[PDB]
Design an enzyme around this catalytic site. Structure first.
Site, PDB file in Angstrom:
ATOM      1  N   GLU B  24      49.725  46.395  44.105  1.00 53.37           N
ATOM      2  CA  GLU B  24      49.551  44.950  44.073  1.00 53.37           C
ATOM      3  C   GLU B  24      51.224  44.639  43.939  1.00 53.37           C
ATOM      4  O   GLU B  24      51.730  44.876  43.048  1.00 53.37           O
ATOM      5  CB  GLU B  24      48.602  44.495  42.942  1.00 53.37           C
ATOM      6  N   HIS B  26      51.500  41.105  44.268  1.00 55.36           N
ATOM      7  CA  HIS B  26      51.164  39.667  44.553  1.00 55.36           C
ATOM      8  C   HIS B  26      52.473  38.655  44.196  1.00 55.36           C
ATOM      9  O   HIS B  26      52.225  37.690  45.110  1.00 55.36           O
ATOM     10  CB  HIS B  26      50.208  39.581  43.163  1.00 55.36           C
ATOM     11  N   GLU B  69      45.793  42.264  46.556  1.00 52.45           N
ATOM     12  CA  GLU B  69      46.641  41.208  46.707  1.00 52.45           C
ATOM     13  C   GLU B  69      48.052  41.409  47.147  1.00 52.45           C
ATOM     14  O   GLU B  69      49.174  41.523  46.326  1.00 52.45           O
ATOM     15  CB  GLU B  69      46.843  40.566  45.300  1.00 52.45           C
ATOM     16  N   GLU B 145      35.685  39.744  44.497  1.00 51.93           N
ATOM     17  CA  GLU B 145      35.675  39.127  43.482  1.00 51.93           C
ATOM     18  C   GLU B 145      35.113  37.662  43.657  1.00 51.93           C
ATOM     19  O   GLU B 145      35.573  37.098  44.596  1.00 51.93           O
ATOM     20  CB  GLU B 145      37.141  38.815  42.704  1.00 51.93           C
ATOM     21  N   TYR B 146      34.093  37.326  42.921  1.00 52.44           N
ATOM     22  CA  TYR B 146      33.608  36.088  42.848  1.00 52.44           C
ATOM     23  C   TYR B 146      32.964  35.702  41.325  1.00 52.44           C
ATOM     24  O   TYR B 146      33.135  36.470  40.579  1.00 52.44           O
ATOM     25  CB  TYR B 146      32.349  36.163  43.699  1.00 52.44           C
ATOM     26  N   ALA B 147      32.540  34.428  41.241  1.00 61.98           N
ATOM     27  CA  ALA B 147      31.900  34.038  40.175  1.00 61.98           C
ATOM     28  C   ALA B 147      32.884  34.344  38.857  1.00 61.98           C
ATOM     29  O   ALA B 147      32.686  34.963  38.189  1.00 61.98           O
ATOM     30  CB  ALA B 147      30.765  34.713  39.819  1.00 61.98           C
ATOM     31  N   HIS B 148      34.038  33.886  38.907  1.00 62.06           N
ATOM     32  CA  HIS B 148      35.222  33.822  37.970  1.00 62.06           C
ATOM     33  C   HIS B 148      34.609  33.552  36.434  1.00 62.06           C
ATOM     34  O   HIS B 148      34.143  32.324  36.144  1.00 62.06           O
ATOM     35  CB  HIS B 148      36.568  33.136  38.299  1.00 62.06           C
ATOM     36  N   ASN B 205      54.662  33.436  30.199  1.00 60.95           N
ATOM     37  CA  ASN B 205      53.323  33.875  30.227  1.00 60.95           C
ATOM     38  C   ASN B 205      52.294  33.024  30.700  1.00 60.95           C
ATOM     39  O   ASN B 205      52.544  31.989  31.179  1.00 60.95           O
ATOM     40  CB  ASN B 205      52.809  34.117  28.680  1.00 60.95           C
ATOM     41  N   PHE B 209      44.306  33.273  30.556  1.00 58.10           N
ATOM     42  CA  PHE B 209      44.010  33.562  31.750  1.00 58.10           C
ATOM     43  C   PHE B 209      43.593  35.219  31.902  1.00 58.10           C
ATOM     44  O   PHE B 209      43.105  35.641  32.903  1.00 58.10           O
ATOM     45  CB  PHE B 209      44.981  33.286  32.883  1.00 58.10           C
TER      46      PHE B 209
HETATM   47 NA    NA Z   1      43.078  36.785  34.906  1.00 58.05          NA
END
Ligand code: NA
Ligand SMILES: O=C1O[C@H](CO)[C@H](O)[C@H](O)[C@H]1O
Ligand SMILES: [Mg+2]
Ligand code: NA
EC number: 3.2.1.23
Lengths: 210, 211
Positions: B24, B26, B69, B145-148, B205, B209
């Site tokens: 990754e 990103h 990513e 990835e869905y529905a966070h 930071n 999250f």
């Molecule tokens: Na996160």
């Protein structure tokens, strides 16, 4: 004296079960047509394009009936208003087709057209194609004609394209119907329908179902 | 790639696994800056090849993933093909570069909505029902990835499931994600509390999250 016996029902009726008034009679025009013994008996017009529609080939296959002669010619000329934009002339006798030859009674004319004005429902550009059957020396036997719209219709990658652009069909089904005359149509009603459709943002009509 | 025992447990208990390369990038600008660079192919290839060599005998692993990513770069295409050639028994997926590149067997978007398009330039997130029928598109779609599920969340979850059930080629997804990444810290009396980003003096930071 003409005599016509019209039957309401026939074996044809089994293929005419559309959801509409079931009527009968001579409901469309009757006409008399005089053609010469040596005649144009059929003709097809095709238009094909380069990748960006800046060039076209108009292709016309013309069929004749009557007796074949070396002096016979076809001219297909293409007109934009009063301006002649392209013309082609040839004797009869098509390309070789199989082991037995070709069609001696047909000819294909091919005309180049640069930057053709394209036909669509948005801008209905039309040229006039005149198909002249005639002698090599120039005596006209007969002429037929049609309106020509330069446009390509194809399905590519799951999209229906007109002149390379994906269509959005704002269509309506339209039966032939008049409240006084039943299924007899006339120019005025037809024109009235067209105007209303286009005034109401329709671009397409389906001949439901005939 | 996970702790080796995880695959053994998934074999025995019965769970389908997407085994993903440790790749990754990103934070790069643009995201594919390293992954399109041939100088970084050796390093990337070893993260992909050594994973396959380790995990290829586990039946729970049903899909290989090229990472996460890192945009879409030519190195991804090369490694996609390496896996396809070395192990034809599993599909390869990868989301970077718009979820439907030539480096993925499965359309695998993150946070694509059910009905609403999000037409970001270069990497649009189409409605998932629309994505399936894009001219030329034939692949199945499974959201990576869905529905966070961040905090008080998962609103509209049913809407995904209605669509998954109605559309054959919508074959589901992976919720993001399983477990809050909080850490235990202690007060003056020795009582434990849940700490997140920024509570350890770590700067810059991204706060809560991680959960
Ligand atoms: Na996160
Ligand atoms: O499906 C149909 O139903 C319509 C009902 O008005 C109409 O009968 C059409 O001719 C037919 O194709
Ligand atoms: Mg019917
Ligand atoms: Na489904």
């Amino acid at each position: 004296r003409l005599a016509v016996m019209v039957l309401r029902w026939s074996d044809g009726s089994y293929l005419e079960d559309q959801d509409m008034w079931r009527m009968s009679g001579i409901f469309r025009d009757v006409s008399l047509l005089h053609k010469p013994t040596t005649q144009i008996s059929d003709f097809h017009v095709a238009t094909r394009f380069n990748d960006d529609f800046s060039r076209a080939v108009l292709e016309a296959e013309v069929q004749m009936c009557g007796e074949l002669r070396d002096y016979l010619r076809v001219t297909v000329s293409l007109w934009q208003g009063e301006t002649q934009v392209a013309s082609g002339t040839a004797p009869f006798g098509g390309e070789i087709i199989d082991e037995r030859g070709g069609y001696a009674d047909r000819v294909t004319l091919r005309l180049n057209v640069e930057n053709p004005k394209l036909w669509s429902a948005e801008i209905p550009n039309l040229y006039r194609a005149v198909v002249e059957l005639h002698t090599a020396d120039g005596t006209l036997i007969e002429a037929e004609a049609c309106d020509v719209g330069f446009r390509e219709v194809r399905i590519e990658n799951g999209l229906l394209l007109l002149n390379g652009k994906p269509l959005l069909i704002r269509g309506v089904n339209r039966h032939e119907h008049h409240p006084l005359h039943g299924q007899v149509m006339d120019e005025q009603t037809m024109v009235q329908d067209i105007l209303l459709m286009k005034q109401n943002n329709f671009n397409a009509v389906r001949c439901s179902h005939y | 790639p996970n702790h080796p025992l995880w695959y053994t447990l998934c074999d025995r208990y019965g769970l389908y696994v997407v085994d993903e390369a440790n790749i990754e990038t990103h934070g790069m600008v643009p995201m594919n800056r390293l992954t399109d660079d041939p100088r970084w192919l050796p390093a990337m290839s070893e993260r992909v090849t050594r994973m396959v060599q380790r995990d290829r005998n586990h039946p729970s692993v049903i899909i290989w993933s090229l990472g996460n990513e890192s945009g879409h770069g030519a190195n991804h295409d090369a490694l996609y093909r390496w896996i396809k050639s070395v192990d034809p028994s599993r599909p390869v997926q990868y989301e970077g570069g718009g979820a439907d590149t030539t480096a993925t067997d499965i359309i695998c978007p993150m946070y694509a909505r059910v009905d609403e398009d999000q037409p970001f330039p270069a990497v649009p997130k189409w409605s998932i029902k629309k994505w399936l029928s894009l001219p030329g598109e034939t692949r199945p779609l499974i959201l990576c990835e869905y529905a966070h599920a961040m905090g008080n969340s998962l609103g509209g979850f049913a809407k995904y499931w209605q669509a998954f059930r109605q559309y054959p080629r919508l074959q589901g997804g992976f919720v993001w994600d399983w477990v809050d990444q909080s850490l235990i810290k202690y007060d003056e009396n020795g009582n434990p509390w849940s700490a997140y980003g920024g509570d350890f003096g770590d700067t810059p930071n991204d706060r809560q999250f991680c959960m």
